[PDB]
């Protein structure tokens, strides 16, 4: 994170529409429920792992913004 690639974090809005709702129904509701639509901040280094994680869960993104540059 110290180098240049470390900075330029990104802001991502996340929607948990029925595609993830069905998966959460089947797997169960074990954490408190939350509204489907929300926004999340992510650094450049962690971008790929968290994005793989969120799509693998089933939620779908609307758009992604670049915080720096």
């Amino acid at each position: 994170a110290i180098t240049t690639q470390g900075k330029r974090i990104y802001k991502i809005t996340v929607s948990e529409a029925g595609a993830y709702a069905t998966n959460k129904h089947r797997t169960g509701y074990r954490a408190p429920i939350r509204q489907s639509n929300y926004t999340l901040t992510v650094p450049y280094d962690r971008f790929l792992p968290e994005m793989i994680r969120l799509h693998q869960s089933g939620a779908k993104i609307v758009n992604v913004t670049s915080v720096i540059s």
Binding site: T27, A31, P32, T41, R46, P49, E50, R53
Partner: protein, 246 residues
Amino acid sequence: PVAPPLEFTREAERAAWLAGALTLPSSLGHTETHGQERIRAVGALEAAQVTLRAPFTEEQFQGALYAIYKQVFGNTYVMESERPTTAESQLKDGRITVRGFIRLLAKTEAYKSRFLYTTSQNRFIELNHKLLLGRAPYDQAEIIRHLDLWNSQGYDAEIDSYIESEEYQEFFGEEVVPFFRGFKYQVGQNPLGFNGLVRLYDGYAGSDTERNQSGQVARLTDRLSRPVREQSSVDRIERLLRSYTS
């Protein structure tokens, strides 16, 4: 004609009579109505979840902070000369979740000072599990994976392996403060997970303190080590015998 009509007064009467010997006091259960007292985890289990709904107000933000600094660091004291105030401010408006805040506290120099520098890597892996997850490690595969991951990619990636794991997503998620959960049967564990969380958690008053004459030695790597890697003992025996008798 035992009871032709819809009334059952004889059947209810005889049921209530025979139920007297079905509810007799047993042999003894005084030390048994609470087996958690033997596990010494009564306080840990009776500690409820500490969530932070984003529109939360000023009060219980300090409550969530107390829970976090009690969990992540253990019961070790953390002087507010050490509280990252910028991280708490960022968490206040939700610029970061409780998961991101716990990521930061894991990556502060106080957490490292208490857990990394004074201990071997084994104790560090056990403590990461017990604090950022709530459970003892189940098998040597976890220890090997985390040790090699740290060695190859840094403390940063080693911690990110905990914080953004799917176990953290499922059990706690973005906005629930971690808690000790190995005392209950968590799906897909060994019986060594519960034993390990009992071994690491010696008391509610106690803590995992660096400033100790033990040197904060590893409580569990001996416990965790044998089961996976002693099935080959039966042959290493006679190999050692031929080495000795030579």
